[PDB]
Amino acid sequence: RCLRANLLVLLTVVAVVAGVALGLGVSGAGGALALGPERLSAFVFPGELLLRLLRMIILPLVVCSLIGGAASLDPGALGRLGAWALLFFLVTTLLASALGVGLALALQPGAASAAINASVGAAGSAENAPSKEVLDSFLDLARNIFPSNLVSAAFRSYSTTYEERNITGTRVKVPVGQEVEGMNILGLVVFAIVFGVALRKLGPEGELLIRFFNSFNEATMVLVSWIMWYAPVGIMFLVAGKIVEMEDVGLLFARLGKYILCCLLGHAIHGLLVLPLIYFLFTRKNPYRFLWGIVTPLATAFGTSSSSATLPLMMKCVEENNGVAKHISRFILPIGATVNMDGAALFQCVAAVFIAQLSQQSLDFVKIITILVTATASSVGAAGIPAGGVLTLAIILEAVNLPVDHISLILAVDWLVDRSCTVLNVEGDALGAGLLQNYVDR
Amino acid sequence: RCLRANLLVLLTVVAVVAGVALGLGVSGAGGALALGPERLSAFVFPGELLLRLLRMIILPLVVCSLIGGAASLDPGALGRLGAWALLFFLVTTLLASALGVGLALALQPGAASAAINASVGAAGSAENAPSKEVLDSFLDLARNIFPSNLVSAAFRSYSTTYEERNITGTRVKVPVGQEVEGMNILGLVVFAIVFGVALRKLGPEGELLIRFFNSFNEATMVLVSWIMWYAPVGIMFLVAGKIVEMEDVGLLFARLGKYILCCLLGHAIHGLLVLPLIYFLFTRKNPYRFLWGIVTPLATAFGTSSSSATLPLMMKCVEENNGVAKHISRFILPIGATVNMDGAALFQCVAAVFIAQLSQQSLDFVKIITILVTATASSVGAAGIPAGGVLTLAIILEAVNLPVDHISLILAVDWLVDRSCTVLNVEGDALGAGLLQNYVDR
Amino acid sequence: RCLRANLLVLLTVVAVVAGVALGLGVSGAGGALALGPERLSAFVFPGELLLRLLRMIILPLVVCSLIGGAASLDPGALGRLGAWALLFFLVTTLLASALGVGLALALQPGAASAAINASVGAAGSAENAPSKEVLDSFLDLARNIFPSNLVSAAFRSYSTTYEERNITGTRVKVPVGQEVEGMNILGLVVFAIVFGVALRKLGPEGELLIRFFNSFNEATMVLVSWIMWYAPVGIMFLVAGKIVEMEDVGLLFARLGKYILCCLLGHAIHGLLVLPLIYFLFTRKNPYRFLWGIVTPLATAFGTSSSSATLPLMMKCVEENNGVAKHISRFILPIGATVNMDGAALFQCVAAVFIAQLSQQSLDFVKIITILVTATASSVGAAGIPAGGVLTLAIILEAVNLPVDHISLILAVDWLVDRSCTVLNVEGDALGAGLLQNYVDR
């Protein structure tokens, strides 16, 4: 039944297209002048509603899915599967970063152009920042893993601020911990996997609890169906809202066209050559057919700019349309949503290269490898915090000591590349799910 | 067994009467002069303890009851039942507001009297307020519906503050969202109903989870029994505490007797003529007998001034004493506790009319209809926030542009009318439960 | 299998010993000068990780254990068991306080010595404090019992700050409530016991829910096993971190040797004569063998300085090694972890006596009894708040009006005596568990 099967793909594609058309027409016809902030808020609001609907069920879905999938196979197979999945994510993220190096060195976006100016973008506020240390970020990562409390971990995550408690002499900034908003999805993933291993290692005592969690998860898929049916409207109004929020006739595109073209082509080549080729090589099966099976979550990733938010739609689509195993999907896809950030590593690396390129820095081999490794680590380093969309580049440049004086340039256009990032991240997660499913089948 | 059956009614009535006697005697004998703030806190404390006990179980009770009642009948019958319930609540709230217009126009409480003065009540602090917009309030309502997170929704609710991020020119206050304390009982109700529909649409997978939620709820009724047995002591000390908190020899009654008489008679006529008449007309059965069946929750509503807090006692009383169906009670009464505010619409409307009446405003027909409609909407608009006992009148007067310069007059006596409001709200919820039960029986 | 059975005892003892050796060697070799704050944070961090791991599971473990143990015996037996347990805890805490009086009067630590000076310790900051009232502390205790919300009670606890809302005249500090961080473990214990009674009073409806909670708890024991296997590393680095945090060559020991010797000998005599003698007298069974069975939690108590944190390890050890009944352990040990603070009452009393002794106060009989009773009450009074490690002594001295001008002396060395306190508290809990188990056996 092609007409009924493909209707969602048609709606979300038409919704994105109508969103760009609506927002461009509104902006050309006056935009905010005709709108005002109150009508702007009401215009964006259905997008916010979609995010609120999707951020509601990621907690039940992730927790119950990991508990019900981790306890569907013995711990030895679980360990082999997880180790191979972590290796696949690490390899793809490293490859994406190297690919970004390759394009950014070649196309040369940091040539002399309008983007040389940074007074308007920075205006002195770029240097003023928390300036979080790399060791502190890794410690906050390892403390958001193994959370202090599970309930607070369902809406809070450790972040280490810095105080000036060194009044005795030579004032130096010293860390203090204070939980701040944002889910600890990584901590819940770890606790859920560990708990599922525990129930599998129990026997008749845990059958009840597995049945509980699987039923809870299936009810959450039942919610996901209806949120999917709503999702095109939210995508339309969210995309339209964000392009009325800043004029996009082509001024920033004319300013940073080479950079944005690198980031988008890097995401496309990573999305449309590499991971498809890996899927070819290993499972010998059609990646473009599989990719077509998952278009509504990819469009939702584009619309939402949040990999965790599109995950329920993605798990529903992958289990329903594509012939992916339920337990493999349950285990792999949430872990991919908090570890695997191929596009994030990509445009973080391309950003670092671009800002090094302007002012004519060297970046011969050692600095290249450092950016690769720290980008691969920051793929998960940014995962714990939702606020740090591109904030983690600053700590990389602190580690490698590059000019952070114009980091604010990308904040004007973080909202475009991060969408393709989210698309690529969920894409890599799904391709890994299919690949590992067919391993476990073999 | 009349002697054992009616003992609770006797205790709570005697507790309210002893509370007023105790507080009046303490106030006449010196009150705070003989008491001091520390003994005042210890005096009020058992009332606070009762509220803490009741605010503990509304979350488990509401969530599990809606999940266990929503999944006891098919979604078509659920939709018809819910639509008719929402219509009944809307009709009763609209009627209560119109009734308030009718009394407030006739008895004329805004005549020239001591209440003409407002310098002491306001003293310039009345104008200083958040001044929340109507669109912003509706958006916060629709964001507390569909919560961002369920766990935080179990003790937090979206409220839109306003900042001054328009330093570029013509400084205008712009909204910012920040979650603030207070349960999102509306959001949990919606999620629970939706989830119960999901489990009914599943089959054998959800039987386990329905049995879980029903058992959890029955255990919470078991707690409700003992909290009921404690409740008269808390009611006594809470009423006594609140009348020692302000002298009530008759000064404020002499100041605002016409207003308070309108609000109380409006609640009585709504409670003792209208909803009884509707129950007569539809089910042909004794409303005063039914009303006598539920007196302990009504007295608790009077004592607590919190419709959500008396709800567990109300559900226990309605399922146990009166012949109301378990599933109908479970579904209807929590929804009534967060949507149906007949008395709230009533005294909000009467307050608006009274303050319009002093200074001799017109309010011919169009303004009357606007106050009716915005009061019917603010019945649920105030439900999401516990802090806004009478705060939502300010946004109505902002919508219709009346003098808010003496809104602080009612804050001295918000504590009296709101009790009868809570009584009427829970009364309307129960009458709707009986009426809709007998529809579903037919 | 002695070699495999005793390996954990060997690891944790060797870990504590290696911790003191490592920290003393680091401090002598330069300490912070060679370390810096960043490496200091990384050095302490595995200890923080152990606390985070243990603070994660106390909520599931305590809640599910009480629900599964409270509903394993009828309410009459539960009431007799609980009343005898509360009496045993009260008797042991009172005895510990009296024992502290006996040593502190005799050994005389408040003699004229270096500890007479307090300018360096206090410097005027000792008097500046919240100065919480005794009535307010008891009210906050009774409000953390019977929490307003369960979810917030899983990471927040009521604390009454004080404002200056008396600008009318004679400015006096008036209480205001505001929830502050720290679990309401007492409130969850009460709700869980009450809920378990509810499920036992139900029949077939609650069997499902008991099976759920028991399975959840057994999975949490499965986590406890692995946290136990990690625990020696955390103990080593935590002890080493805390002794590098302050130089401990003997300066503070030379300053307060008599005081610390009293506190440690009081804990030892309470731990090694009294509770063993009570166990002798009642069950006629080997307390030192039993004490040897539980050494890893006692060492963890020493390392962590947190009675609630070592509780999962303690329950696992007591149910597994020693022949203690599952339901008795489940019921008694969490209650002991939030009520029974024998060592806390002890060193609070010894602290009060010591500061009275310097400046040569009388403390004849009545003041002695007041310190005994208020210490026995503050055993639980400090339990609700984790921050008040020794903060509750100030309210005692406010009650009895002693010099608080040098309370900051103990803050330099609160970190040593509180460890032996935690050891003694968990010890008394376990001895009570064995004693009451053998009563119920009889």
Curated annotation (Swiss-Prot), chains A, B, C:
Na(+) 2 binds at residue 338. One of its GO terms (biological process) is erythrocyte differentiation. Placenta, lung, skeletal muscle, kidney, pancreas, and intestine. Expressed in CD34-positive hematopoietic progenitors (at protein level). The chain crosses the membrane at residues 6-35, 49-70, 85-107, 179-202, 212-239, 261-282, 328-354, 415-436. Glycans are attached at residues 117, 166. Regulated by L-cysteine, which can either inhibit substrate influx or trigger substrate efflux without being transported itself. It is found in: Cell membrane; Melanosome. It is a multi-pass membrane protein. Sodium-coupled antiporter of neutral amino acids. In a tri-substrate transport cycle, exchanges neutral amino acids between the extracellular and intracellular compartments, coupled to the inward cotransport of at least one sodium ion. The preferred substrate is the essential amino acid L-glutamine, a precursor for biosynthesis of proteins, nucleotides and amine sugars as well as an alternative fuel for mitochondrial oxidative phosphorylation. Exchanges L-glutamine with other neutral amino acids such as L-serine, L-threonine and L-asparagine in a bidirectional way. (Microbial infection) Acts as a cell surface receptor for Feline endogenous virus RD114. This is Neutral amino acid transporter B(0). The gene is SLC1A5. The chain holds residues 47 to 488 of 541 of the full protein.
